[PDB]
Every structure is written in C-alpha cells, then in structure tokens.
Paper text:
Here, we investigated 31 diastereomers of the α-helical AMP KKLLKLLKLLL. X-ray crystallography confirmed that high or low α-helicity as measured by circular dichroism indicated α-helical or disordered structures independently of the number of chirality switched residues.
Crystallization screening provided good diffracting LecB crystals with well-resolved ligand electron density for complexes with the fucosylated analogues FHP5, FHP8, FHP30, and FHP31. We considered the nine most potent diastereomers detailed above, the Lys → Arg mutants HP32 and HP33, and the inactive, alternating chirality diastereomers HP30 and HP31. Although the inactive undecapeptides HP30 and HP31 with alternating L- and D-residues in their sequences had almost the same number of L- and D-residues, their flat CD spectra most likely indicated a disordered conformation considering that an excess of just one chiral residue was sufficient to indicate folding with sr-ln65L6. Diastereomers with four and five D-residues (HP11–HP31) were generally less active against bacteria, especially against A. baumannii, K. pneumoniae, and MRSA, although they all kept significant EYPG vesicle leakage activities, reflecting the fact that vesicle leakage activity is often not sufficient for antibacterial effects to occur due to the much more complex nature of bacteria compared to lipid vesicles.
Author numbering:
A (entry chain D), F (entry chain D), G (entry chain C), H (entry chain C): 2 to 12
B (entry chain B), C (entry chain B), D (entry chain A), E (entry chain A): 1 to 114
The structure:
C-alpha cells in the first residue's frame, strides 16, 4: 500500500 | 541469477496467465524471441486473472516474463516443473514492494495445449 | 501414489484456477477438509479458464482436487513447488483418454494472496 | 501416470545419486536408452548414499529409474525441476511397503556437470 | 529474492548432501536456527559428493544453505518441491564465477528420513 | 476425441 | 519391515 | 578457473 502500511518489519 | 526466462520447445503453443495481488497496478510483458507477444495490465488484491492467452514459442522457444509497477521492474522469482515427463509449468512470482510475499503479479505458463 | 492432495497452512486464503484442453467436458471438484468448496465445469481445447476462485484452507488445511469427464475420474499428476520459501504453487494435471498429454484439465493452486 | 522417466539433452553427462531409508535392501537401476547404465544397491534407515555415478545420456537422452526390493518393484513418484533455466534436477521417490513415506529409495539426477 | 533458506517441520531429521562441479574448492555451510550444523568442503569437476549428513531441524525448522569459494559467497538459486504431499526436496544451486552453470556446488536437502 | 482419432500410438 | 504388501492372502 | 569476478579492476 505504501509507507507506514504493513511494511513487513514484524514490529 | 536471471529469473523469468524459459526455453520452451520451438514452435509450440503455450498458455500464459497472470494473477494480481497488490495495491499497485501490475503490467506484465511476455516476450517471445525478445519481442513483446502479449501485454497485460490490471490491479487486484484478490488474485484476479488480469490476462490469459495462447502464444506460440516461435523459432527460438525463448519466453521471457517481465513485471513492472508504475514503470519500475519488480524483483522476480521463477522455476520450471515437469510432471510425468510431459506436462510443463513455468512459474513466476514478483515483488513490487517491501513485504516480500512475491505474489504481486503471479504468472503461470503451461504446455502442451489442446 | 495419491495425487491431487495438498496440505496448506490452516485458515489461509488460496486461489484455485482450472484450465481445459480436451474435447471432453471437464468437471473439477475442489474439496476443503473433504467437503466440496468449489465446482467447475467447462469444455475447451484452447486452455480456457473454466473457473477461478478464492477459497479458505480451513481448520485442516487439506485441499483435494478431483477431475472427472462424463462421470469417470481422470488420472491425476501433481506436485507442490515453493519459491523463495514463501510463494506456493500446487499443480495438477489430468488425463481423460489415451494420448497422455495430462493437460485435459490443468489446475493451479497458489498462495499467499493479497 | 508413468513415473521415473526423464528426457535429458542428448549426449550429456549427468549425475545420479541414490539414498536409502528402509529396512529393505534397495536396488536402483538406471537405464539409458533402455540399457542398464548403473545398478546401485544398499541398505540404510539413515539416508545413506548407496551409490553415486556420472553417466552419459546417449543419443536419445532417455533415462529411466527403476527401484526394487528383493525383486519387487517399488511404487514411484517423480518430477523434474529447472532453476534459472539452466540447472536441472530429476527427482524420484519410491515406496516399498505400506507407510507411504516414499523415501525408501530416493534418487536425484542432476545436470549439467563440470 | 532470498535463496537457500527453507522452513522445515520442527525437530525433524533431514538429509543434506553436496555435490561439486568447479575448479574451485567449494565450502558449504548448513545453518539450523542460525547455528552451523555442518560444514562440507571439497573439490570436484565430476559431481563428487563432497559431503552428506543427517541433521535435525530443531525447534524452529529454519535451515539455511551458504556456499563460498576461497571465502567468497556464491550466488544461489533454490526451490522446494513436494511429491505426493509427503516427500520433500529443498534444492540449491550456486555460481562461483562467470559461466552461470549454477552447478559449482549443488545441495540437496531431503525429508522425511527413516 | 475418441476412437480412431489421435490415440497416441505413433503408427 | 518384513515382506510388505501381499501378506494375509486367503481368508 | 582462476579468481573469478572482480578481475580487471581499474583502467
Ligand atoms: C502497497 O502498495 C504494497 C502492496 O500492496 C499490498 C496490498 C500487498 O499486496 C503488498 O504485497 C504489495 O507489495
Ligand atoms: C478425445 O476425446 C480425447 C481428448 O480430446 C483431444 C482433443 C485431446 O485434448 C486429448 O488430449 C483429450 O484426451
Ligand atoms: C519394512 O521393510 C518397511 C520399510 O522399512 C521401514 C523401517 C520404513 O522405512 C518403511 O518406510 C519402509 O517401507
Ligand atoms: C573456475 O574456477 C570456474 C569454475 O570451474 C570451472 C571448471 C567450471 O565448473 C565453472 O562453472 C566454475 O565456475
Ligand atoms: Ca508484495
Ligand atoms: Ca501482495
Ligand atoms: Ca489427454
Ligand atoms: Ca488434451
Ligand atoms: Ca516406506
Ligand atoms: Ca522409509
Ligand atoms: Ca559456474
Ligand atoms: Ca561448474
């Protein structure tokens, strides 16, 4: 979706 | 390593089908002997078939799948699988962002047909 | 060996797509936890998509593909392939006659979606 | 469907390797153009390499893997996988009994070599 | 995309076997849960088995194959294939140079054992 | 297609 | 272990 | 054979 959205960091 | 390039038997009909799973619009270019033979473009987060066609592998048999989103190439993963020495699948996944689900465009090539 | 049975991760959405390449009408039954979750029926000698749907693998994750022509089960071949430890394809071919091209119904299952 | 038969490129060196996972002694015959090119034999329940050999696919490229235990043919499963359109694996599993783990003899064919 | 990383079922014995096809000495590290479980080393241009070992996937099931030549990491290609929903192969090829045959070290992981 | 039609004999 | 399939022929 | 990628650095 873009910035801030479900990036894939696992935080 | 190079991904998304497959050597088919020459002059053989094959199916190419593209699925979309991303907020971004997927553009799929299917090259046969380094020339565009089909172009798909669509958007879906629900695995929609954005295109499916029968193509001919031509004199060289070289088929290449390219995927881009807003003009930028996606990272590809690919492999070919053969069942009972006859039924062929050439498989492509692509990633257009950061989550690495590699499903943003999924392309399946299958032969023989008919 | 058993063919056309796949263990998916539980409660996971997956795509199932069926292609036809035969003079006979192909009926594809997709079972999830041993119960029919989708049914496709169509005829093509040109690799037409006779059905494509999003299903949920449910509590068991067991997905089974059955193919029949005029009420008689086709012989199946199948395998699962995983790319970059994330992108999954479960692949089925089927033969309804004698020429053993195993493309008469071709079923592709893919996950994850979205 | 037929299993354990693969079409290799002609006159090409390939590796064939067999692993054993069974109480029964495994006998693996590798046929090239219907001639016996290699016979492996061994017993292991710990995946021992019971044989590995470089062979040549000959003018036809036809390679067939047969597995037997005490003279009884095992049920075979097989597929071929190609990575980056270059690296080939022909894979065989086999079942000599009732538990359907299909690992009793496992055979891996790989090419190109060198 | 990441290559050479596979999720195995937890606490499961698996086989790992490495073949060499290169003028350069191949070093293969097999990591389980980021710990070095095995190191293979050898040189062959004839597909020699430079190592084979039974290992345990541990509580996490995370297995990673690394390949290096004289300290330099090789480019990896990989995939996993499952036959009859039971028999698993995790496949790795690697390129240490310029000819892109991706066979310089070939690594096969298979499970279940026994 | 059926009987007599492209059986797959190679004759 | 043992002979495999084909035991328990008969009644 | 030889060192591999990374030869022919420079001019
Ligand atoms: C956002 O643009 C990223 C993008 O779309 C998401 C819905 C998800 O499919 C993600 O995998 C994709 O890269
Ligand atoms: C005839 O019914 C056999 C049948 O249809 C053919 C056109 C061809 O697709 C063949 O593979 C299929 O079994
Ligand atoms: C007995 O011969 C059966 C046989 O050996 C077992 C130890 C186990 O590996 C089983 O899978 C195999 O069929
Ligand atoms: C030289 O080190 C290159 C190397 O060894 C060759 C004999 C050949 O196997 C090549 O593929 C490999 O990269
Ligand atoms: Ca993505
Ligand atoms: Ca996605
Ligand atoms: Ca057919
Ligand atoms: Ca057909
Ligand atoms: Ca067994
Ligand atoms: Ca066994
Ligand atoms: Ca090389
Ligand atoms: Ca090499």
């Amino acid at each position: 979706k873009x910035l801030x959205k479900x990036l894939x960091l696992x935080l | 390593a190079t991904q998304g390039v497959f050597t088919l038997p020459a002059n053989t009909r094959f199916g190419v089908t593209a699925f979309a799973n991303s907020s971004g619009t997927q553009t799929v270019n299917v090259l046969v002997n380094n020339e565009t033979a089909a172009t798909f473009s669509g958007q879906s987060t629900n695995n929609a078939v954005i295109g499916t066609q029968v193509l001919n592998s031509g004199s060289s048999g070289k088929v290449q799948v390219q995927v881009s989103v807003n003009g930028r190439p996606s990272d590809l993963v690919s492999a070919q699988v053969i069942l009972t020495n006859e039924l062929n699948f050439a498989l492509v996944g692509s990633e257009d962002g950061t989550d690495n689900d590699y499903n943003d465009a999924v392309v399946v090539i299958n032969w023989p047909l008919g």
